[PDB]
Amino acid sequence: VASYDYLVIGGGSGGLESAWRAAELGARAAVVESHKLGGTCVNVGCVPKKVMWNTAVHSEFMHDHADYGFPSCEGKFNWRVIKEKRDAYVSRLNAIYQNNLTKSHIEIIRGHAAFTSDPKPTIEVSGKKYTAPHILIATGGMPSTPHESQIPGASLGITSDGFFQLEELPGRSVIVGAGYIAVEMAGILSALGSKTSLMIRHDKVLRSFDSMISTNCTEELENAGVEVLKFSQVKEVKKTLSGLEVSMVTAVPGRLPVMTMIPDVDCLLWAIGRVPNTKDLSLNKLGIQTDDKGHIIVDEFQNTNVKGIYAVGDVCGKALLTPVAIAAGRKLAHRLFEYKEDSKLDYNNIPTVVFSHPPIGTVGLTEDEAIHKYGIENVKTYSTSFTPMYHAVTKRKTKCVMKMVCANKEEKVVGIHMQGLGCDEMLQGFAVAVKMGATKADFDNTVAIHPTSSEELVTLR
Amino acid sequence: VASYDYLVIGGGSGGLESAWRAAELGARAAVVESHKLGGTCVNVGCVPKKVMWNTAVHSEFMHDHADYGFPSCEGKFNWRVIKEKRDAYVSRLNAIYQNNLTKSHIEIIRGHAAFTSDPKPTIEVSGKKYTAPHILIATGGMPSTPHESQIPGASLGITSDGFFQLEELPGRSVIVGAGYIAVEMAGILSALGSKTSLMIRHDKVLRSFDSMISTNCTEELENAGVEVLKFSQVKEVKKTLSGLEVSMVTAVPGRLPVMTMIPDVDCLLWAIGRVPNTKDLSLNKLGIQTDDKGHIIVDEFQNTNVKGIYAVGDVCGKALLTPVAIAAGRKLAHRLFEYKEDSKLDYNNIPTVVFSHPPIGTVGLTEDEAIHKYGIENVKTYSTSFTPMYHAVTKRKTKCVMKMVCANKEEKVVGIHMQGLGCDEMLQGFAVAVKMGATKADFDNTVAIHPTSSEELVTLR
Ligand SMILES: Cc1cc2nc3c(=O)[nH]c(=O)nc-3n(C[C@H](O)[C@H](O)[C@H](O)COP(=O)(O)OP(=O)(O)OC[C@H]3O[C@@H](n4cnc5c(N)ncnc54)[C@H](O)[C@@H]3O)c2cc1C
Ligand SMILES: Cc1cc2nc3c(=O)[nH]c(=O)nc-3n(C[C@H](O)[C@H](O)[C@H](O)COP(=O)(O)OP(=O)(O)OC[C@H]3O[C@@H](n4cnc5c(N)ncnc54)[C@H](O)[C@@H]3O)c2cc1C
Ligand SMILES: N[C@@H](CCC(=O)N[C@@H](CSSC[C@H](NC(=O)CC[C@H](N)C(=O)O)C(=O)NCC(=O)O)C(=O)NCC(=O)O)C(=O)O
Ligand SMILES: N[C@@H](CCC(=O)N[C@@H](CSSC[C@H](NC(=O)CC[C@H](N)C(=O)O)C(=O)NCC(=O)O)C(=O)NCC(=O)O)C(=O)O
């Protein structure tokens, strides 16, 4: 058994930051990674996705070519070309991440970690034992897929992982899910050409976001060639000699269920959820508590119930974002190694952008949550809806919706929600201002930047 | 002589806002406008310019087409097509502005106002006299042009106004100036195809912005096909049977002056400065004080030396931006009509974006100004320089530079400066945060939005 000061299991987003931060503080760390470093984000998440998004966004502006006085280009997107580059990039970030670890004197124990029956928390990677006074579990999660028992033929569909393994643009796509991933896949596949259908159990997507986003996003989706099959469920899936045959049930409230076949399907993508990578860690060896779905139960300080063990990131099941895993890994290192006893991540006012078309940006409370936190009498909301001047000369259109939620009589901005061009880069500042406890006056007392879509947020009346 | 409660001379940006704000407060107002309403911004500024910018930005992304797996389109931008649309839009905003005035019960006295020799401040528009207990001078400015006496042949060049009257894309362009306008024209003409040369008296452009912006902007300009002729001056201009012949002197410090001819010039654009529209107001009739260059001298509250007369906007010569004219017109109405005795515009931390390629965003103090305000010992600056992941797969490249200036030991962000993709929409939030008196911790305690260029600002180390 070899001792370190920190043994972080998982070379992902939260994993690495905590490892790096720890080393700066003089700690002797090592990171265990069983696959490629950089975790999900870099290999099958933020990075590969965003390249595909910039590409889909490219397909759109090309449509607007003639309106801007330019001749037209046919199209016929070559997926292979871009898949090759996307991959190259991803493999260049790998070398980089590895470099930085070794530059920081952080060992990388390549393999699969599992806890042992040894009294003090000790882990075993390929026969060898390693322990540390502080161990972090940053194993993240995996895409979930239905069971053949529930949906016979489920194994025939792919997931976001599989999406990143795709070599050519599928002619017909059906996506099952109504969250940001589902939406983003729907957006990219449809912009690049696949005849996309998004299949949701309800009438809207992103049903957890402010109602405006939920509503607008379902709209923009439809208005862009994506077919939204509301109130539908895949009953079973079959492999025909031409494609896949999705047998789905559609039960619109007030109507009788209608069974339907969607044939000639090239791709069936499962964007229904994420499961934790906890199973094979042998948590039961130490009695490390988890929930019914396998996530790892932690406190305000990422502590497990076992002294010396913490967990951060997707594995915990909360605020599943790279910057959140990162931020919590960062604060932990400062708590354990810098002794900042109250170093912890504030999970309120975490900003998030969905890369739909146009992009969604949001931070803070929804109207509902403000209503149920402060009371109707105390919640004011300001909003606007305009078409960006980019579409002043184009026949193709998209809107921009902005909503400001304000609490109490001072008008403390407790939440911002918006959708439209520039909203992806436009959100950070407001998240900082919002984090500071900005009121509607602070926003309204800032000189506008004209012409921008961002000036609308500071002139809401 | 007909009485109103407010008589605002000038249907521009500052003019209108003050008129509208006044009406909401129950005041009897009227606006005098001698031309099209909406002033400079709408007719020959923000609006027309920005359409041309979105168009130039379109030319660029088209270059990146093949890298994103799309076939290539030749090009051959048709200027007429877009000029027609840009104009249509501008004429649709006119109807709109007019509408809103009448909806607010604001009269529009169409014509040219001039003060009279009548004891109490009274103005005369086309024979008729009008007075008010409060009169606002929102007459803005005009593009300046050299005198034939100084630069013989100067009258042969056009200005930004003339640029908006252009019907076809000039084959060869030479721009004289090193400010945001000069730069923006250089950017658009060059992206759309003209063989552009930007002529500056020094080695860099935007010499008033933080040194980083000054430096980076001169670079990006060159790297995009714009020829920067540093240390050069147009000596005289001549109309040949093929184009114009710019005779210019180039005096690089340490070298002997070299006289040069630039022939076959289709366009000579004068972006050397703005002059105030004060001459014909007959200010001398009341002794309304002005400076040597004709701007109108005002105090913290936009007051002239004459009781009952104020001035806001470009006419004053300070912070020449639409949102600034607007913001000051707004505060004045609230002061005069809502009685907010201390309602005035704070001219510190006014945000500004230059629409260069990529866009520049800035707010606050430059390093120099922080250095000379706090002292070297008390100024820390953080910065980064990265290539946006949009260029991860493109052969064409651009950077992104970010600089944070921090004062004292708390690290109060007194200034932010940046250049690159998304910086135009990315700036508003930080301007609000900066306005609030945000420190580097508030920025650093905000959860990042990945992947974006904006996340870089909140992770500067
Ligand atoms: C499609 C798709 C797009 C996404 N897009 C975005 C986006 O734009 N922005 C965003 O913020 N988030 C996005 N996410 C979410 C983000 O990727 C995750 O929230 C984030 O990576 C979580 O970090 P983590 O540190 O817990 O784990 P992870 O980064 O997932 O990585 C865990 C690492 O641990 C390794 N490991 C697992 N178990 C063990 C073990 N027993 N021993 C050793 N090795 C092991 C894993 O192999 C992996 O490399 C996306 C996710 C998917 C899927
Ligand atoms: C190229 C170009 C691009 C620009 N781009 C931007 C940009 O992207 N963003 C930005 O913020 N700013 C930009 N500006 C600056 C902005 O346009 C001006 O700062 C702003 O319009 C100033 O407002 P104002 O209220 O003082 O006057 P103005 O809006 O200029 O208008 C004054 C009005 O008064 C009328 N008038 C004049 N004298 C009289 C008189 N005696 N009686 C009656 N009528 C009269 C004028 O005709 C005019 O319509 C740009 C300017 C130019 C030129
Ligand atoms: N923000 C720009 C920068 C370009 C970019 O993608 N840069 C990164 C890829 S981000 S993909 C990986 C991801 N991000 C980061 O490493 C940097 C992003 C930001 N500083 C943040 O902390 O959120 C992550 O998993 N980090 C682990 C950790 O630090 O804990 C890279 O080149 N980095 C190499 C380097 O570090 O020099 C963009 O997104 O376009
Ligand atoms: N911000 C979006 C909105 C689209 C847009 O251009 N909208 C404006 C043109 S801004 S061009 C004219 C300019 N801007 C405004 O009227 C609105 C911009 C913002 N609210 C601000 O106050 O800075 C101005 O001179 N205002 C005088 C004043 O209010 O004092 C328009 O349609 N307005 C019609 C309307 O008012 O409904 C964008 O720029 O793309």
XYZ file of C-alpha atoms in Angstrom, chain A residues 21 24 41 46-47 50-51 54-55 58-59 61-62 64-65 67-71 73-78 81 85 92 192 322-323 331 345 351 353 355 389-390 392-393 422 424-433 435-436 438 442 445-455 458 461, chain B residues 21 24 41 46-47 50-51 54-55 58-59 61-62 64-65 67-71 73-78 81 85 92 192 322-323 331 345 351 353 355 389-390 392-393 422 424-433 435-436 438 442 445-455 458 461:
138
model
C -5.379 22.637 -6.698
C -0.337 23.839 -5.660
C -16.706 16.783 -21.116
C -18.841 19.854 -23.895
C -15.921 19.744 -26.366
C -19.743 22.254 -29.141
C -17.721 21.537 -32.312
C -20.552 25.500 -34.303
C -21.022 23.307 -37.380
C -22.787 27.156 -39.850
C -25.471 25.306 -41.752
C -26.088 31.160 -41.642
C -25.430 29.570 -45.057
C -29.057 33.443 -44.998
C -26.347 33.834 -47.671
C -30.253 37.733 -48.267
C -26.886 39.243 -47.455
C -26.126 39.783 -51.099
C -24.041 36.649 -51.515
C -24.617 33.949 -54.135
C -23.950 27.419 -52.151
C -25.811 24.116 -52.672
C -24.882 22.311 -49.489
C -24.203 18.599 -48.914
C -22.427 18.600 -45.632
C -19.649 16.081 -45.357
C -14.512 15.566 -42.772
C -11.294 17.138 -37.103
C -4.916 17.193 -28.765
C -27.003 19.256 -40.692
C -18.391 20.627 -15.832
C -17.998 24.019 -14.157
C -13.170 24.369 -3.051
C -19.636 25.428 -3.453
C -25.443 29.643 -14.734
C -26.536 27.660 -21.380
C -26.920 25.086 -27.157
C -31.562 42.911 -36.052
C -29.588 40.149 -37.714
C -33.807 42.593 -40.131
C -32.824 41.651 -43.687
C -25.674 35.857 -28.465
C -24.474 31.925 -24.983
C -21.748 34.512 -24.508
C -24.137 37.104 -23.071
C -24.882 35.246 -19.829
C -21.671 35.286 -17.777
C -21.720 38.886 -16.701
C -25.282 38.782 -15.563
C -24.526 35.591 -13.588
C -21.807 37.492 -11.737
C -24.094 40.452 -11.158
C -24.470 36.315 -7.819
C -23.616 39.643 -6.200
C -27.973 42.822 -7.904
C -28.135 48.191 -10.661
C -28.230 52.140 -13.987
C -25.749 50.638 -16.401
C -25.120 52.389 -19.680
C -26.318 50.273 -22.579
C -24.173 48.869 -25.412
C -26.049 49.657 -28.703
C -26.671 47.841 -30.979
C -26.666 44.468 -29.135
C -29.293 42.009 -27.872
C -27.700 42.395 -24.426
C -28.829 46.006 -24.109
C -30.693 46.550 -18.983
C -39.536 48.458 -18.330
C -39.514 60.602 -20.357
C -44.606 60.221 -18.989
C -27.590 56.568 -34.917
C -25.393 52.466 -35.159
C -28.217 51.006 -37.287
C -24.328 47.372 -37.807
C -26.222 45.976 -40.827
C -23.369 41.659 -39.876
C -22.758 41.520 -43.631
C -20.952 36.987 -43.167
C -18.176 37.323 -45.703
C -17.637 32.764 -42.015
C -18.149 31.928 -45.711
C -14.576 28.944 -43.164
C -17.190 26.967 -45.139
C -13.314 23.567 -43.083
C -16.727 22.825 -41.643
C -17.359 20.161 -44.223
C -19.387 22.361 -46.543
C -18.681 22.904 -50.244
C -19.339 29.276 -52.690
C -17.418 31.596 -55.051
C -18.442 34.958 -53.672
C -19.094 38.239 -55.510
C -20.990 40.221 -52.980
C -23.744 42.348 -54.405
C -28.966 44.270 -52.866
C -32.411 46.449 -47.541
C -39.093 51.421 -41.150
C -16.609 42.778 -48.504
C -26.149 56.776 -28.327
C -26.647 55.109 -24.945
C -31.886 61.559 -16.128
C -25.424 60.556 -15.559
C -19.258 50.399 -21.690
C -17.895 47.922 -28.116
C -17.265 46.434 -34.242
C -12.522 26.949 -30.213
C -14.398 28.094 -33.287
C -10.125 24.737 -33.549
C -10.964 23.296 -36.972
C -18.598 37.094 -28.741
C -19.876 42.318 -28.434
C -22.649 40.527 -26.579
C -20.349 39.383 -23.770
C -19.701 42.845 -22.315
C -22.985 44.026 -20.786
C -23.021 41.835 -17.734
C -19.503 42.658 -16.766
C -20.290 46.381 -17.183
C -23.100 45.972 -14.657
C -20.874 44.012 -12.307
C -20.569 49.332 -12.181
C -21.524 47.676 -8.898
C -17.148 44.174 -8.142
C -16.952 38.242 -7.036
C -16.784 33.086 -7.249
C -19.155 32.768 -10.167
C -19.684 29.370 -11.713
C -18.353 29.289 -15.254
C -20.374 28.642 -18.431
C -18.388 26.030 -20.482
C -17.659 26.084 -23.369
C -17.690 29.882 -23.972
C -15.080 32.632 -24.379
C -16.805 34.413 -21.478
C -15.734 31.763 -18.979
C -14.068 34.488 -14.524
C -5.279 33.488 -12.515
